[PDB]
Design a protein around this ligand. Sequence first.
Ligand SMILES: Nc1ncnc2c1ncn2[C@@H]1O[C@H](COP(=O)(O)OP(=O)(O)NP(=O)(O)O)[C@@H](O)[C@H]1O
Ligand SMILES: Nc1ncnc2c1ncn2[C@@H]1O[C@H](COP(=O)(O)OP(=O)(O)NP(=O)(O)O)[C@@H](O)[C@H]1O
Ligand SMILES: O=C(Nc1nccs1)[C@@H](c1cc(F)ccc1O)N1Cc2ccccc2C1=O
Ligand SMILES: [Mg+2]
Ligand SMILES: [Mg+2]
Lengths: 291, 285
Amino acid sequence: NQALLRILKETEFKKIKVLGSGAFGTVYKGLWIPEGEKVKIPVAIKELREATSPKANKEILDEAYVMASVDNPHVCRLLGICLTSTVQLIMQLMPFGCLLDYVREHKDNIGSQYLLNWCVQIAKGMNYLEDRRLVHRDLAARNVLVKTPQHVKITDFGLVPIKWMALESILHRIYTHQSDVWSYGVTVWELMTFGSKPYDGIPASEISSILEKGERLPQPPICTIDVYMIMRKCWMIDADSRPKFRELIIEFSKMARDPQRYLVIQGDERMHLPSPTDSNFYRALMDEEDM
Amino acid sequence: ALLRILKETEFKKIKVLGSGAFGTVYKGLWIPEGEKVKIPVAIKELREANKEILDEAYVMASVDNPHVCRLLGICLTSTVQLIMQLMPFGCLLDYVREHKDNIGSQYLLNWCVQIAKGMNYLEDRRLVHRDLAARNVLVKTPQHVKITDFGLAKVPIKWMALESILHRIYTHQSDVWSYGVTVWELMTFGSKPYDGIPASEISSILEKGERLPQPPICTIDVYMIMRKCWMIDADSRPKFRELIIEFSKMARDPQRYLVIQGDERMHLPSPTDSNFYRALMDEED
Ligand SMILES: Nc1ncnc2c1ncn2[C@@H]1O[C@H](COP(=O)(O)OP(=O)(O)NP(=O)(O)O)[C@@H](O)[C@H]1O
Ligand SMILES: Nc1ncnc2c1ncn2[C@@H]1O[C@H](COP(=O)(O)OP(=O)(O)NP(=O)(O)O)[C@@H](O)[C@H]1O
Ligand SMILES: O=C(Nc1nccs1)[C@@H](c1cc(F)ccc1O)N1Cc2ccccc2C1=O
Ligand SMILES: [Mg+2]
Ligand SMILES: [Mg+2]
């Protein structure tokens, strides 16, 4: 249990490059130096922005033990923590980065099989968090990490992103597994638009109004009606009418089996998944975990 | 499909890590086509038909065991360049020298288990190493070692069985002799075997019945194993199967079989530190 979270010393790791920043901290590429060893192992470090007290560290640790306890191929696990004045959190470094950036950078290189498999894998990860009764609260393509292009994992769960939130979260601060489904719908839309900004040009303060009026994110140019309808079902006002994560796995798996029937992409026939050869090569170098 | 054919343009060597009797090993970077990442690899540039090389290279790509390094890719355009996983800890010989004050019996005995497991697997596949030595055991984590450079035949006199020196016979039972030398290397914390004796004289002193001396930390139980690896009759030597069993037995009571000062303090990592180690560096089964 708590043996899954390692307490680190200041002296055994170093930040080397700023990777980006979010609402609660700045993420660095760093290096772990095992005591008495000579190697420097790349990690990702999130240093929180606001310094905390010993008493607030007790809260932090309690959540830290939980996030360190997740075991699923499409869910990132928290690995260590350093209780400096500003607390530092250590997890595995994903050199491909987040899926939001990956889809933006390859928006001419991505075929239907990749996109549909990402949606399946993200649903798998969220379904697990639901089994653990862990509410993500901040799902978004920026919080899906690319371990290899064939393998993505959800991060920063269980801790405002108005444009990803369910209406009841905006209006009443209600966060459930069914509001996470709304955020999944927006995340999928992000992918299918290759990283467009949702409700681009609408002030965040006015989003609840347009949702109550029934306005929703538009149909991506590549999405058939079948895919768009799923996204729309994630955005129902009645949270219990939204699909469940298990249903989303079954449905996107069905589509991934005939990807070109459900996604219409120009040049889709020249981009396919990697040969068995190239996956085995990817796995032996970057991705040795079970699935 | 287990051996990836690489183009020159998709990897770059950046730093020399060392050289041995068959090539130079470089720390390198793999750059996937159409991606922006740079993945560290180890590249061994050799020197000595491409389809033949490939055929043996395919065999080396086909090994599947947690204690045997797999050949991952190959580039045959100019020199033969072999691509495998980069082990930032380096080889076990250097590790034992650098940590010769921190290595306790539990680590030492478990390394002997793991090296035997890998060699037993090679025996199952009928692959003769021909160059086993502590320098050919890579440290993945301090807790996890793997045999490398098996099958590079495509001379370490002081690791070779007598019949290999005299008659060029290489079997799994001569690998056993080299396993015996490898274990002596570990238990001496990386000493050079038969130090100061020219290689030209090893065959003479073996025939005269001289063998490597008992490491100061080894009980007689452990030294007897090493001596059985060095019998002149190859078939009286133990099997890698038996070696797994005995070192496993000894690893269950490590301080009874190795006498190390302060050993009662140098225990294997806590579940916490292994879980942390494995998630960062060692996700395999
Ligand atoms: N484990 C990691 N490995 C590599 N890159 C990472 C890792 N975690 C985060 N990043 C990158 O760092 C960026 C900034 O992290 P973060 O602080 O979580 O902000 P954000 O995810 O973009 N927004 P948010 O978490 O919703 O407030 C991310 O967008 C990623 O590209
Ligand atoms: N995958 C690897 N990762 C890290 N270091 C490595 C790797 N492979 C080999 N090395 C190191 O590279 C150096 C040269 O290796 P190598 O060329 O096989 O020579 P050697 O094993 O020391 N002598 P030889 O018996 O001829 O192979 C040694 O210090 C090895 O430890
Ligand atoms: O560390 C996280 N992200 C990072 N990005 C770069 C390097 S670490 C994030 C997190 C990581 C993970 F693997 C799984 C779920 C997560 O929620 N957590 C955990 C936690 C615990 C207590 C207080 C704050 C945080 C916090 O932010
Ligand atoms: Mg994030
Ligand atoms: Mg070698």
